[PDB]
């Protein structure tokens, strides 16, 4: 298959210029798209043949191309210009083919997490299927939730859902462990480990089974 | 689990003792994939066979202060107690009835607790009475000569489900999955049926082979089960039961199991075909009226089966125990109530332009 | 200017066929130049392209999904349809639907309707299970597992209650489970009495839970 | 005792607070021999001025990060709060309604917990505006200038009773009697009536001389008194207010009373003149209807006054804590089942002619 | 041969009047030597005799009693009335009515009357309270208090109880009470529960009471 | 008033002949009128006229008179002729005057009586108005019972009611205390004192407030 790669991640300097890269095979003949997503968001077209804008999008957004590599430059950058950038051509492959996306963030203030643990309740241990529940609250950057029952590390079994930006603040997790009812009689030790910018030690907070 | 589980079929009430009791079968078998049905008839046993084949006789002792009585002269007295004329006059040969007894497919003798072994090999023509743990006290049939049943069937049509060529369970005539997974041959009047689960006892037409039931077990939130034997280890110390324990040796899930009820100080059993309950409504639409088998319920004395009484309003053991404690729950709900700040005897005011904690903007 | 709504069946059985409708109406699928287009982006994954039809019954269609999608015109309506068969769980996604411009000599979408919510799942409609999760500030919270259809209206304290509830994610059983959790007063744990309201209409579940510490 | 006591009258709801609230009144006196009784008509006070003479108000302080406000001002932004519209925009005066607070009979002043003293002596044309414990905080009316309320009566007719040619009750237009004895005199706009019995203020027509109510008490099975103060100090000490705990400040015996409310997490009260109950039904007929005033009563999201709540159906928390006990009794009663003789496991048997005891001759 | 049957008020509140009639078959009033007398028995006293009126409309009277009996013929029906003014509590007693036999000269009465219960008190009909009376046998009962128009149908495990219930004694209130009593074995108690079926037809009180050892 | 006297409470050898009295101003002139009452029944004329008996009363009973005192004579007594038997004339005073009646006692064989006591329920001592209840039952004969509230006579407060000879023995009472809830949280003694004549001793069961 037809394919062309841009950066995931890039990060920029809040104000300044920022520069992502898009590059496929022969880029220099066909022409190139460029799309921002923002946080669940359909699409919109910021550049499109290799350099022009839609009527709406400002002057700060470019593209250009040299070789089969071309790029979209976004000058001045704001906060509100982070989002997904997603760019595209034809081929012969397919009529459309999108780079798995960039994710352009912008950064500067950190937080930190308060972190509360949850154990399952009298009703789901009757169930036989224990819950364990770590949700974090008010943290920037986002980024890691271990999981100690008997102080034993769990990996490979648990989920994980969040909230977005808050409106006002910009920092929100929900961590979830399943044992099961011989599996949550049997050890004492259930502990929750977090790990974060703000953070200067890894946060645990710890529960026994009474 | 469904919220209560109702008789969709009740057979006749058998007497028994507490001895007689035993907590609920609560197993259920999905069968996965098991998806073509395919419409179908089929055998089944008439409810109140299903558990056993009971065969009431009577309890013929002597006296004048004891003597072992002679069988023609207690069955003279059988006959005369039915209608007690020249009976209680009474050398005394006194009766007592009826010694429900149970029919072993196996050999045919009869079971019960009065018989040495508990078992007699039976009546026939040149055995007219069963002996019995005492000596000077007799047992003998209501029949003179007692018949092994045969006419014990229903007709019956449900649809079969197979996952592939071979079919797995099917569905019987009031709609409940039945699973032929764990089921064993059982041969009743010359058919080779299958007890299925709880003694579900069905004869199809198709023949499988499977395998058969020992001759040893042939009469008669898993939390639940030992709720239950606690209810039954409580009935047996005191020798006494209560409606409230009464409704915990309710089969919880739906499909075969015994009832239970009391009346007028004689405990008693009977065969039924359990029915999930989605809503309390649907079997209480009425002030008095328990919908089974789509009618209202006839109680005796106010007592209907399974804990189920009767202020003139039927009341549910497992349906009380809830709205109690659902109610009791929201009445007991709390509230800070609003005060307004300076509605208080002790609220401290910190001198100076220095406002107070009143966060209302 | 230029919308484009999708419409379809929010929920489709995996190996069933599914089939989705963009109407729209700032320009002429009867011009020489158009085309209507339908990109799918499963949640968090990168957008990928599904099928493109053009104002002369072309139909373009990506390599990776041809052999299962039909994509159709009707330029009489103003509607295309998109169907794809066997449906397969990962294909669960937001379709959207997006108007290809039609001056420019190589492909690219202008337009782009709110794309649709797709999800594949394979579970009959089934109730919410509501556990409660317990405690200068402390915090309680309710867990609403194992729902199927989405979505769950958590509501605490007759939504009287004002201060995070969660998205859902989906489990190990094709069921879907979403928490909710609130700050109150440290103080009135255990003399302000907090219940949380939980609606699954999809099986008009409707169960409300007690949340106090031990 | 009656089983439960409705109101058949309920006045308009107030906002209070906890320290409001206050056990019943639940005296009741027979008149003995008065029995000559005769048609007459007289006077009484409207339902919601009985138990006090509310006169509402609010609260305006100051911020900019104190200062006191200025009347004018903080009667400006009453208005404002009325609509909100340049009023959420705030140097900022923050005001809070409505501030209800009493009117005192005897000099008009008005009480109410926020005074120093929880006194005002009085809004006049040059006094506008009470002053707070707060310093920064004043008090203004509703009304630019309140008028004493003298529309506040209601015409009645009842029968009264005379054991002598003086006489001792009467028995009011719903029906109770009511006796004079223990009554003072309190002059309603200017008219000398008898507070009663919890306040029941009537004005006769005939006037004998009697003793008058003294300027204190002039605003606003005896285990059950206790019952209840435990109820109240359960709540203060919590500052927490349970449905249950509600449901015992209720007037346990027919006559004038306040009745307790909650809504949307503030506390409320309002006069009542209840009606003995005969049967939990005359009062619940319906599914979800509570008869109060021979009608259905509406709830404020599920909530009836007095702990009576509302699954789609009205609770009483005096009914369902009796129904529970008395269901739950019925559930728990035993029997010893029959068991026949020979049915035991161990039934020992005492070898020889010596007849056991089966004494049923 | 000869019957006679009292009819009338079975209770009357005192100072208001009783008015009894006696209806009698065997026998002629309209004879030239019969009479019809009453004779009244306070509970547990002796008999008194009251009136008797002759065939000719002579009516004697008990010299304590003049002034209030009122006596009357109607030979046509064949009954005679008892007439009592002023009723006062003493009064209460079995009221018989009797022939006084008429070939013999001096008076005798040869006929009786299974005579009437008049019982003359002030209260209004009042439902009864009951309360227990608990525990190589024991014995338990259940005490009805406080009932008014006698008399009270005490049932025990619904009359499937089968061994001593008591009369009323006149309270000191004007009402009345009894007890009923049963001895059961007492291995049974605490573990075959004992309840009272009270029934008070006149206030249609029915009252069933739980009766254990503490 | 006019009155003649008979004795109360004859008693007899059963299968003698008893006698009872009735005597009054001039009986010797006015003839005297002899009447049985069993219990709960309405009276039976036994004699009349002095001597004469009804067409089905047994030669047994008779009665003769002897100056102004007639008398009943009851030869061979049967124990079902035990009854009250009143005595009757007419006067100038009034038409028909009774002796208040005279009680035959026929006797012969001696019982004793159990005695359960029973404490006031909780229920009653929730109205304030505490009782006690003293049962007996099957004695013959059947004449005492005292109340011993703190170790100390209770008299002039009880009542008692009886029900009659039981078909089968012919041997029963209730006795009644009335308390007020004050003056029952302050005694502690509480016993039942009983005397008859197949009691060797006179029996008391006590009980404490607890
Ligand atoms: C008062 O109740 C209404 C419902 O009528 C509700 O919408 C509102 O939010 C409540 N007030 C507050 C402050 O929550
Ligand atoms: C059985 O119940 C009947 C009522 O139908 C009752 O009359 C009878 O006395 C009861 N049997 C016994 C032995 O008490």
């Known amino acids: 298959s037809y394919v062309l790669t841009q950066p995931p991640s890039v990060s920029v300097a809040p104000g300044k210029t920022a520069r992502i890269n898009c590059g496929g095979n022969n880029i220099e003949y066909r022409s190139v798209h460029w799309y921002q997503q923002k946080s669940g968001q359909a699409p919109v077209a910021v550049i499109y043949?290799?350099?022009d804008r839609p009527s709406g999008i400002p002057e700060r957004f470019s593209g250009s191309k040299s070789g089969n590599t071309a790029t979209l430059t976004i000058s001045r950058v704001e906060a509100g210009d982070e989002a997904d950038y997603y760019c595209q051509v034809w081929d012969i492959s397919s009529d459309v083919v999108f780079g798995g996306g960039t994710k352009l963030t912008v950064l500067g203030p950190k937080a930190a997490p308060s972190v509360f643990i949850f154990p399952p309740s009298d009703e789901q241990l009757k169930s036989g299927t224990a819950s364990v529940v770590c949700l974090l609250n008010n943290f920037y950057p986002r980024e890691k939730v271990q999981w100690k029952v008997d102080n034993a590390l769990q990996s490979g079994n648990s989920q994980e859902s969040v909230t977005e930006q808050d409106s006002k603040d910009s920092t929100s997790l929900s961590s979830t462990l399943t044992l099961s009812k011989a599996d949550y009689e049997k050890h004492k030790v259930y502990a929750c480990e977090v790990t974060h910018q703000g953070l200067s030690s890894p946060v645990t907070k710890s529960f026994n089974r009474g | 689990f469904p919220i209560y589980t109702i008789p969709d079929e009740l057979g006749p009430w058998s007497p028994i003792d507490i001895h007689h009791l035993s907590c609920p079968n609560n197993l259920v078998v999905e069968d996965e994939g098991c998806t073509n049905l395919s419409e179908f008839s089929y055998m089944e046993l008439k409810v109140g066979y299903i558990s056993a084949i009971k065969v009431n006789g009577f309890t013929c002792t002597g006296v004048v202060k004891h003597f072992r009585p002679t069988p023609d002269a207690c069955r003279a007295a059988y006959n005369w107690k039915m209608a007690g004329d020249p009976r209680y006059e009474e050398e005394s040969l006194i009766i007592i009835s009826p010694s429900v007894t149970d029919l072993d497919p196996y050999d045919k003798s009869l079971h019960s607790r009065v018989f040495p072994g508990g078992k007699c090999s039976g009546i026939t023509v040149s055995s007219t009475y069963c002996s019995t743990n005492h000596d000077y006290t007799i047992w003998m049939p209501e029949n003179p000569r007692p018949r092994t049943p045969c006419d014990i069937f229903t007709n019956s049509r449900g649809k079969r489900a197979s996952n592939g060529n071979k079919t797995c369970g099917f569905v019987d005539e009031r709609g409940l999955y039945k699973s032929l997974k764990g089921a064993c041959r059982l041969k009743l009047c010359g058919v080779l049926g299958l007890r299925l689960m709880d003694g579900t006892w069905v004869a199809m037409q198709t023949s499988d082979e499977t395998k058969w039931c020992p001759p040893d077990q042939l009469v008669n939130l898993v939390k639940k089960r030992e709720e239950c034997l606690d209810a039954l280890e409580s009935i047996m110390t005191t020798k006494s039961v209560s409606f409230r324990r009464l409704s915990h040796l309710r089969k919880l899930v739906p499909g075969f199991g015994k009832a239970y009820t009391i009346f007028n100080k004689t405990l008693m059993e009977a065969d039924a075909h359990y029915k999930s309950v989605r809503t309390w409504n649907e079997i209480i639409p009425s002030k008095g009226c328990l919908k089974v088998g789509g009618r209202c319920h006839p109680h005796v004395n106010g007592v209907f089966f399974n804990g189920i009484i009767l202020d003139d309003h039927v009341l549910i053991p497992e349906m009380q125990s809830s709205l109690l404690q659902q109610h009791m729950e929201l009445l007991k709900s709390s509230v800070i109530p609003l005060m307004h700040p300076l509605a208080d005897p002790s609220t401290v005011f910190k001198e100076g332009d220095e406002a107070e904690d009143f966060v209302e903007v | 200017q230029i919308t484009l709504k999708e419409t379809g069946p929010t929920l489709v059985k995996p190996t069933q066929t599914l089939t989705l409708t963009c109407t729209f109406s700032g320009f002429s699928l009867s011009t020489s130049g158009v085309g209507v287009g339908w990109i799918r982006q499963p949640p968090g994954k990168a957008l990928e392209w599904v099928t493109l039809?053009?104002?002369?019954?072309?139909?373009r269609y990506s390599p990776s999904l041809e052999n299962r999608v039909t994509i159709r015109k009707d330029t009489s309506k103003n509607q295309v349809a998109l169907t794809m068969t066997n449906m397969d769980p990962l294909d669960t996604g937001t379709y959207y639907c997006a108007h290809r411009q039609h001056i420019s000599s190589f492909p690219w979408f202008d337009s782009w309707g709110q794309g649709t919510l797709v999800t594949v799942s394979s579970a009959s409609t089934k109730g919410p299970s509501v556990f409660p999760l317990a405690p200068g500030t402390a915090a309680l919270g309710c867990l609403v597992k194992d729902y199927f259809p989405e979505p769950v209206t958590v509501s605490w304290n007759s939504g009287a209650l004002t201060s995070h509830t969660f998205p859902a994610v989906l489990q190990s059983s094709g069921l879907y489970s979403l928490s909710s959790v609130v700050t109150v007063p440290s103080s009135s744990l255990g003399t302000q009495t907090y219940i949380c309201n939980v609606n699954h209409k999809p099986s008009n579940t409707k169960v409300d839970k007690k949340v106090e510490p031990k | 005792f009656p089983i439960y006591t409705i109101p058949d009258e309920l006045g308009p709801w107030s906002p209070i607070d906890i320290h409001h609230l206050s056990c019943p009144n639940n005296l009741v006196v027979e008149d003995e021999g008065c029995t000559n009784l005769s048609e007459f008509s007289y006077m009484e006070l409207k339902v919601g001025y009985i138990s006090a003479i509310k006169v509402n108000g609010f609260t305006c302080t100051g911020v900019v990060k104190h200062f006191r406000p200025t009347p004018d001002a903080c009667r400006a932004a009453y208005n404002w709060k009325m609509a909100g519209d340049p009023r959420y925009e705030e140097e900022s005066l923050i005001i809070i309604s409505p501030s209800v607070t009493d009117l005192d009979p005897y000099d008009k002043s008005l009480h109410s917990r926020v005074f120093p003293g929880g006194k005002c002596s009085g809004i006049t044309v040059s006094s506008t505006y009470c002053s707070t414990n707060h310093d920064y905080t004043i008090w203004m009316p509703e009304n630019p200038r309140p008028r004493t309320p003298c529309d506040i009566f209601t015409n009645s007719r009842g029968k009264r009773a005379s054991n002598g040619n003086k006489t001792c009750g009467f028995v009011d237009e719903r029906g109770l009697y009511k006796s004079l004895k223990g009554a003072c005199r309190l002059k309603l706009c200017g008219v000398l009536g008898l507070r009663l019995m919890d306040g029941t203020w009537v004005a006769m027509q005939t006037s004998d001389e009697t003793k008058w109510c003294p300027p204190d008490q002039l605003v606003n099975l005896v285990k059950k008194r206790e019952e209840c103060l435990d109820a109240l100090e359960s709540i203060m000490t919590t500052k927490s207010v349970s449905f249950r705990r509600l449901s015992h400040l209720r007037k346990l015996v027919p006559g004038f009373g306040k009745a307790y409310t909650i809504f949307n997490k503030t506390l409320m009260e309002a006069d009542a003149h209840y009606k003995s109950v005969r049967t939990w039904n005359e009062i619940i007929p319906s599914k979800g209807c509570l008869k109060v005033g021979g009608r259905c009563h509406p709830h404020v999201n599920g909530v009836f006054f007095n702990g009576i709540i509302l699954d789609d159906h009205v609770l009483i928390p005096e009914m369902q804590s009796s129904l529970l006990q008395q269901h739950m009794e019925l559930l728990k009663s035993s029997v010893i089942p029959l068991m026949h003789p020979l049915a035991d496991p161990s039934t020992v048997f005492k070898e020889g002619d010596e007849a056991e005891d089966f004494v049923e001759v | 041969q000869i019957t006679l049957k009292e009819t009338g008020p079975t209770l009357v509140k005192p100072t208001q009047t009783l008015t009894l009639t006696c209806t009698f078959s065997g026998f002629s009033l309209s004879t030239s030597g019969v009479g019809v007398g009453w004779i009244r028995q306070p509970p547990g006293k002796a008999l008194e005799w009251?009136?008797?009126?002759?065939?000719?409309?002579?009516?004697?009277?008990?010299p304590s009693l003049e002034n209030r009996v009122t006596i009357r013929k109607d030979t046509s029906k064949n009954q005679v009335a008892l007439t009592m003014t002023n009723m006062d509590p003493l009064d209460t007693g079995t009221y018989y009515c009797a022939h006084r036999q008429h070939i013999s000269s001096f008076p005798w009465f040869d006929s009786w009357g299974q005579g009437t219960l008049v019982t003359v008190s002030s209260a209004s009909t009042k439902g009864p309270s009951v309360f227990p009376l608990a525990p190589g046998t024991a014995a338990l009962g259940c005490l009805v208090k406080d009932y008014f128009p006698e008399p009270v149908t005490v049932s025990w495990n619904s009359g499937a109880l089968t061994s001593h219930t008591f009369p009323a004694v006149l309270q000191s209130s004007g009402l009345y009470s009894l007890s009923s009593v049963v001895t059961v074995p007492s291995s049974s108690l605490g573990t075959q529960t004992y309840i009272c079926n009270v029934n008070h037809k006149p206030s249609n009180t029915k009252v069933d009471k739980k009766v254990e050892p503490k | 008033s006019y009155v003649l006297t008979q004795p109360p409470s004859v008693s007899v050898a059963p299968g003698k002949t008893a006698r009872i009295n009735c005597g009054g101003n001039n009986i010797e002139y006015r003839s005297v009128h002899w009447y049985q009452q069993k219990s709960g029944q309405a009276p039976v004329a036994?004699?009349?006229?002095?001597?004469?008996?009804?067409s089905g009363i047994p030669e047994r009973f008779s009665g003769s008179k002897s100056g102004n005192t007639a008398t009943l004579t009851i030869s061979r007594v049967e124990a079902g002729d035990e009854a009250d038997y009143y005595c009757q004339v007419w006067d100038i005073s009034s038409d028909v005057v009774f002796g208040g009646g005279t009680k035959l006692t026929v006797l012969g064989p001696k019982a004793a009586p159990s005695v359960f006591i029973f404490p006031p329920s909780d229920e009653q001592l929730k109205s304030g108005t505490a009782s006690v209840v003293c049962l007996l039952n099957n004695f013959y004969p059947r004449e005492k019972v005292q109340w011993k509230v703190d170790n100390a006579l209770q008299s002039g407060n009880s009542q008692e009611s009886v029900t009659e000879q039981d078909s089968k023995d012919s041997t029963s009472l209730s006795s009644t205390l009335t308390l007020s809830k004050a003056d029952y949280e302050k005694h502690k003694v509480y016993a039942c004192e009983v005397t008859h004549q197949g009691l060797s001793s006179p029996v008391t069961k006590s009980f404490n407030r607890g």
């Open positions: 039809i053009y104002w002369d019954d072309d139909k």
């Open positions: 043949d290799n350099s």
